[PDB]
Amino acid sequence: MVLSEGEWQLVLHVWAKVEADVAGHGQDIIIRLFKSHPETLEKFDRFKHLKTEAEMKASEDLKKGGVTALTALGAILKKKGHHEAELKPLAQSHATKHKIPIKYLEFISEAIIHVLHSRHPGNFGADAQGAMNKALELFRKDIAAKYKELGYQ
Ligand code: HEM
DSSP, X not given: OOOOHHHHHHHHHXXXXXXXXXXXXXXXXXXXXXXXXXXXXXXXXXXXXXXXXHXXXXXXXXXXXXXXXXXXXXXXXXXXXXXXXXXXXXXXXXXXXXXXXXXXXXXXXXHHHHHHHHHOTTTOSHHHHHHHHHHHHHHHHHHHHHHHHHTOO
């Protein structure tokens, strides 16, 4: 699969709004992930004790981790598919150190789409959401191929 430039521009135009406040978007996305799929919280040894959304919102560590994760995703998206170099360390850590199944990358993709749909109707109409889904699908397809090369799943 290959995105068109027009599709990449829809992706980047909503990402530009994420970047007004990546920390707040990261909190919403990670909290949505943990609420929709609580099993995913068990993968975060630093956070797995948190019991409520209030505790999650107050966690400086969770906020910082959301900034780190979304910034890495943003760098991937800005490569517009030419992301081999960026996927290498991310695939290795997520396959081998953190043990994140592809299914959980699907869950976080769903959380990203949900939060962008809620926060950014001006830049996340149907065409823009379709483009973001395509970009995240490409990300997951390429990282899954790397997982397999690395010996995981
Ligand atoms: C868009 C998808 C994702 C991106 C771009 C991303 C990015 C990152 C980055 C950059 C780091 C720090 C460097 C590293 O260890 O690789 C990290 C750490 C981590 N990620 Fe992800 N991640 C994603 C999805 C997930 C998911 C779905 C989970 C679990 C369900 C997860 C679990 C973790 C954990 C446990 C750490 C270590 C956190 C810590 O040290 O406290 N990641 N991630």
